[PDB]
Structures are given as C-alpha cells and as structure tokens.
C-alpha cells in the first residue's frame, strides 16, 4: 500500500517553468526535485494499485458442476472426441477401456509399466514423455519450469 508514495513530494507550483507534479524535497541527491507520486513518474505509484480483496474465487451452481462432469464423462466414451483431444488411442482394445481389478495388487513400477503396454495405453504415455521441455517465457523463472501433455487417466475404485 505504501509503494511509490514514501516521500514528502510536494508540487512546486506554476511560477517555476516546470510541470505541476509533486517533486521530491531536499537536496544533495540526484532524486531531489525529481517527479514523484505519479503513475507516469519514475519511482512513483502505479495506477490503481492491486489489492488482495479482488474476486479471486467463483461460485458455481452445484447442479451445473454435476452437469459438466456428466458431459465430460459422456465425451470420454466417444473415440473420435478422444482422438480430437490429442490422445493416441489407436491401439487400445475398446472405449471405454475397462480392465480387471487385479492391477491394484501391483507393487513394482515394472509390473504397472508392463500392464500399460498390454492394453496399449503406453502410446499416450510415450506422447507425454516426448513432450517434456522447458516452459517458454517467464513461468520457467517461477516454479513452473517443465511442461508436458496430460496422458491417460487411470480411475480406481478407492484410494488403494
């Protein structure tokens, strides 16, 4: 809230042949007499400084949220819609792809990786692996360094 306004910074008036903008008081410094407090002044306050009580979050009708999930599920059973989203499902046996319950007994990633090859889900997994790269732009400076595609979603009956 105080950024760009931490100065005395009074305007000089009209008699002196300068623009009527607040100027930093004092002397003996390169900043003395410099423009201040303005969104157009170097070191000044930005126009309409951002606040934390912006509306960050949204309400969605409970029925409308369930409608969206229902529509997304129905779309996942259409092979042409899955292909149009970018998934490599050209070798999977059936859509929707249903597999037996025994995968929940796996303990080693080696077993799970073998299962993904049997049902031909490994092609979409491989599409994700080849797409890993450094993110373009400023986001890599933040904690968003790497990007990749989505890949298949495996749905289990519980948290086991």
């Amino acid at each position: 809230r105080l950024s760009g306004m931490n100065h005395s910074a009074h305007s000089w008036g009209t008699g002196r042949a300068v623009a009527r903008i607040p100027r930093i008081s004092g002397g003996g410094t390169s900043t003395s007499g410099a423009g201040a407090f303005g969104n157009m002044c170097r070191g000044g306050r930005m126009f309409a400084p951002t606040k934390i009580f912006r509306r960050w979050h949204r309400k969605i009708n409970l029925h409308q949220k369930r409608f969206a999930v229902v529509s997304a599920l129905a779309a996942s059973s259409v092979p042409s819609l899955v292909m149009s989203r970018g998934h490599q499902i050209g070798n999977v046996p059936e859509v929707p792809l249903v597999v037996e319950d025994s995968i929940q007994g796996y303990e080693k990633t080696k077993e799970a990786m073998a299962f993904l090859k049997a049902i031909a889900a490994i092609d979409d997994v491989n599409r994700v692996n080849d797409s890993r790269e450094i993110r373009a732009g400023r986001g890599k400076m933040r904690n968003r360094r790497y990007v990749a595609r989505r890949g298949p979603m495996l749905v289990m009956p519980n948290n086991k």
């Binding site: 400076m141 933040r142 904690n143 360094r145």
Partner: protein, 121 residues
C-alpha cells in the same frame, strides 16, 4: 528437501550460499566400477590425495591425483590437469567433481567409517 525443493529461488540460494561442510557433499564424484563392487557405494565426496580420471570436458580421459578441493570455486585441482600461461608457467585447471570418477580412495579411519555406514549390502 535438502537444497532441491518446490522453490527454484530457495533451492539455488541453498546451493550457492552453502557452508563449507555442505559443499563437501555437493562436491562428490562417482566411484569406479572396481570400487563400486568392492565398497557397494555409488559415489563419495572427493578429498585431497584421491586419484581421479576426467570423464567429461576437454580433459576427458586424463588421470591424476587430487591436489586441492577448493570448495569456494566449486572445483577440484588435479596434478596432471594443467595448462600454460602467457609467460610460460604452468597453472592448474579446475574441474567440477561430477565430471570425474574416483579410481583410488585415500583411506583414513574417518573415511572408512563413511564407507562402512554408506555400504548398501
């Protein structure tokens, strides 16, 4: 976690402002296949009087003895890894420890304790 975490800024700060003892672990090199089988340890921190061979860089394939672990320039000094200055004197060239491989270990009573507790068997 140690150094590496969800913040790149915090991870890099933890690395480049590391104290001397943290730098020792960061300046580790892999053991040779002969030493890996003997001690069941993947890698060890490099120390003086160790024998290493350069595996990556211009000096790749050059063997020598570690004469200094600078730990301030993040390099190790090898006796046989050097070059000539303009005036004709020989000056050492610094190599990052992760680009070399330890072929002979300088064994002390403290160094045996590290190898014993790092044994994977």
């Amino acid at each position: 976690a140690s150094i590496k975490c969800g913040s790149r800024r915090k991870a890099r700060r933890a690395h480049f402002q590391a104290p001397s003892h943290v730098r020792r672990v960061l300046m580790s090199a892999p053991l040779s296949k002969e030493l890996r089988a003997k001690y069941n340890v993947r890698a060890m921190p490099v120390r003086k009087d160790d024998e290493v061979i350069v595996k990556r860089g211009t000096f790749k394939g050059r063997e020598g003895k570690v004469t200094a672990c600078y730990r301030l320039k993040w390099v190790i000094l090898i006796d046989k890894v050097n070059r000539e200055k303009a005036n004709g004197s020989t000056v050492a060239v610094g190599i990052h420890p992760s680009n070399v491989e330890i072929t002979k270990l300088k064994l002390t009573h403290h160094r045996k304790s590290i190898l014993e507790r790092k044994d994977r068997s």
